[PDB]
Write an enzyme that holds these catalytic residues in place. Sequence first.
Site, PDB file in Angstrom:
ATOM      1  N   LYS A 212     -15.785   4.368  -2.701  1.00 24.29           N
ATOM      2  CA  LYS A 212     -16.401   3.384  -1.807  1.00 24.29           C
ATOM      3  C   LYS A 212     -17.785   3.837  -1.362  1.00 24.29           C
ATOM      4  O   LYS A 212     -18.183   4.974  -1.569  1.00 24.29           O
ATOM      5  CB  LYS A 212     -15.496   3.132  -0.602  1.00 24.29           C
ATOM      6  CG  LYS A 212     -14.304   2.286  -0.935  1.00 24.29           C
ATOM      7  CD  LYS A 212     -13.472   1.984   0.323  1.00 24.29           C
ATOM      8  CE  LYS A 212     -12.410   0.956  -0.007  1.00 24.29           C
ATOM      9  NZ  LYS A 212     -11.392   0.810   1.045  1.00 24.29           N
ATOM     10  N   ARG A 246      -4.877   6.014  -1.514  1.00 23.32           N
ATOM     11  CA  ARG A 246      -5.047   4.947  -2.489  1.00 23.32           C
ATOM     12  C   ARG A 246      -6.277   5.273  -3.331  1.00 23.32           C
ATOM     13  O   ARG A 246      -7.377   5.381  -2.795  1.00 23.32           O
ATOM     14  CB  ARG A 246      -5.189   3.568  -1.785  1.00 23.32           C
ATOM     15  CG  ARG A 246      -5.365   2.381  -2.712  1.00 23.32           C
ATOM     16  CD  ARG A 246      -5.439   1.082  -1.906  1.00 23.32           C
ATOM     17  NE  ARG A 246      -5.689  -0.115  -2.717  1.00 23.32           N
ATOM     18  CZ  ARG A 246      -6.867  -0.494  -3.226  1.00 23.32           C
ATOM     19  NH1 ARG A 246      -7.965   0.215  -3.036  1.00 23.32           N
ATOM     20  NH2 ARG A 246      -6.948  -1.619  -3.942  1.00 23.32           N
TER      21      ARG A 246
HETATM   22  N1  LIG Z   1      -4.273  -0.279   2.508  1.00 19.59           N
HETATM   23  C1  LIG Z   1      -5.558  -0.464   1.897  1.00 19.59           C
HETATM   24  N2  LIG Z   1      -5.668  -1.409   0.968  1.00 19.59           N
HETATM   25  C2  LIG Z   1      -6.891  -1.605   0.399  1.00 19.59           C
HETATM   26  N3  LIG Z   1      -7.324  -2.482  -0.523  1.00 19.59           N
HETATM   27  C3  LIG Z   1      -8.594  -2.268  -0.729  1.00 19.59           C
HETATM   28  S1  LIG Z   1      -9.591  -3.222  -1.884  1.00 19.59           S
HETATM   29  C4  LIG Z   1     -11.240  -2.575  -1.615  1.00 19.59           C
HETATM   30  C5  LIG Z   1     -12.250  -3.690  -1.385  1.00 19.59           C
HETATM   31  C6  LIG Z   1     -13.521  -2.942  -1.069  1.00 19.59           C
HETATM   32  C7  LIG Z   1     -14.239  -2.309  -2.082  1.00 19.59           C
HETATM   33  C8  LIG Z   1     -15.383  -1.599  -1.754  1.00 19.59           C
HETATM   34  C9  LIG Z   1     -15.791  -1.525  -0.409  1.00 19.59           C
HETATM   35  S2  LIG Z   1     -17.264  -0.595   0.060  1.00 19.59           S
HETATM   36  N4  LIG Z   1     -18.612  -1.517   0.456  1.00 19.59           N
HETATM   37  O1  LIG Z   1     -16.981   0.335   1.149  1.00 19.59           O
HETATM   38  O2  LIG Z   1     -17.475   0.312  -1.091  1.00 19.59           O
HETATM   39  C10 LIG Z   1     -15.058  -2.131   0.598  1.00 19.59           C
HETATM   40  C11 LIG Z   1     -13.919  -2.829   0.266  1.00 19.59           C
HETATM   41  N5  LIG Z   1      -9.027  -1.284   0.041  1.00 19.59           N
HETATM   42  C12 LIG Z   1      -7.977  -0.837   0.778  1.00 19.59           C
HETATM   43  C13 LIG Z   1      -7.800   0.162   1.771  1.00 19.59           C
HETATM   44  O3  LIG Z   1      -8.690   0.874   2.143  1.00 19.59           O
HETATM   45  N6  LIG Z   1      -6.603   0.302   2.275  1.00 19.59           N
END
Ligand SMILES: Nc1nc2[nH]c(SCCc3ccc(S(N)(=O)=O)cc3)nc2c(=O)[nH]1
Lengths: 273, 264
Positions: A212, A246
């Site tokens: 991320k 994860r």
């Molecule tokens: N329990 C749990 N489930 C999750 N599902 C996801 S999908 C990620 C979507 C995304 C991608 C990239 C960025 S960024 N701008 O920080 O790189 C944000 C969100 N994530 C999580 C998480 O953490 N926990």
Amino acid sequence: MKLFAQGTSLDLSHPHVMGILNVTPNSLIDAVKHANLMINAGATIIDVGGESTRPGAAEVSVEEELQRVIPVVEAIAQRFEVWISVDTSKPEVIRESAKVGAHIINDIRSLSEPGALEAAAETGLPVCLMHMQGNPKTMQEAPKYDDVFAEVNRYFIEQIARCEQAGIAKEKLLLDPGFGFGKNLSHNYSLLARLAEFHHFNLPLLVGMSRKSMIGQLLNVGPSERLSGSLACAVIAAMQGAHIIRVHDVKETVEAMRVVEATLSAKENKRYE
Amino acid sequence: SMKLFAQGTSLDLSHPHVMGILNVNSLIDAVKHANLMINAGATIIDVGGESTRPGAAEVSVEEELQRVIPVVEAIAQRFEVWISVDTSKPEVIRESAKVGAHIINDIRSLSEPGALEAAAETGLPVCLMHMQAPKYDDVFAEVNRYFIEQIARCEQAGIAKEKLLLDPGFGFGKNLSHNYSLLARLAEFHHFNLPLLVGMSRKSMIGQLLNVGPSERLSGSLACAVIAAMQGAHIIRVHDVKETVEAMRVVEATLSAKENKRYE
Ligand SMILES: Nc1nc2[nH]c(SCCc3ccc(S(N)(=O)=O)cc3)nc2c(=O)[nH]1
Ligand SMILES: Nc1nc2[nH]c(SCCc3ccc(S(N)(=O)=O)cc3)nc2c(=O)[nH]1
């Protein structure tokens, strides 16, 4: 600590690796191939997700999400013994997933969608509650907190109450601070630094930092160059007692988690703070 | 605000440093490898590597000087990086300091005849490493008392406490169980108020746990570094510099957001 679903259980005495399996665009064949590779690398949970919740993501119809997700969950549950988490917010996906063998409802929206709370309850399955400020369309526009740890902590209090009133018992719940979900760089690191303090709820802790922007912005590298950063985050979390990590890079994370396990097993109090 | 001083420069130990390992024609390739490690973000280069491993072929005074001195000299002339020198011999300590070495890194904690006096003469920082089927009552307590002993021995010989670094010596007379016991309690060694140096990179404490070859231990090595650095370890000695530096930046961002600035 244990979780129970579909006539099996998950022992949370040692940190678990949850492999990411995105089924946003043969699709089903490739998915099961990927799950298999992740199982053989030591993942004990596969997170199946058919809706992108990246910043700026568009919503997906319930019929599209069902077609992406349900054949994949089914095929995995019929072939392997690995636990299956379903990364969805939709009541119908929750029901249909549980019916075909899913074990955890991993909702980034903490069952905020109409009917999601009731559907999750009906399944009996464990439920992860994640913190997000706003929604994926706008969460990263201008994340703002007076005190991010306090606000995330308050959010968990509230959402735990909410799940209890709907008839979901604490012992089914997991907590996740939601790295990247309406947080700037400094907000994410404040949460990681104080992660051990979320143990007071006495619930499993789940974290998802893999690849991320909290790694990218800090290192100034793109998404394929973030492995070492991702491992560092995983280890920092797992050393503070996080139960599930994860990740995209399963083999490497599992290796790092062994070292953490050895270190915690040698320690007296079994956590860092 | 811990700092070390040597050769007219200082090392700021408010954040963790990565010390890259250099294996000692030779000279062109040594400067090449040093340059790559600096580009990857190493702030200290440890000169020795395979030639100085325990079990390796002992060498004569004149051979070690011929091998070590021109490398230290060449690095000191071309770069601002700090240079750690792997040696046990007093002549090599002396001549290394003359050509620009910053740290004496003797695994034997200056046990050979003349080594302690030669180290004292240089005025340079000195690493005190612990060494010895292995066996202990309380491996931590035995390492701890060893440090109490070496600090006094060094101070006896006129080496200021301000010049000492403490290293528990991972893999030196320690089974897997003893090693993880020391890592788990690494933070307790801060009561000395001295710098902590650790070297776990690619060692058996990883290899045995994961059951993989020497070249397949990056992930466990990084885990070790992060575990150490989160407990306030000041210098991490490694083979994989770029990756360790990236991991250390994550640790540093985490530690800067923490009130304590350390995990225990
Ligand atoms: N329990 C749990 N489930 C999750 N599902 C996801 S999908 C990620 C979507 C995304 C991608 C990239 C960025 S960024 N701008 O920080 O790189 C944000 C969100 N994530 C999580 C998480 O953490 N926990
Ligand atoms: N300050 C400091 N200097 C060092 N120099 C070395 S050389 C590596 C020798 C070795 C290799 C492999 C194993 S094993 N059997 O555990 O895998 C032990 C020793 N190490 C260190 C260290 O740590 N600190």
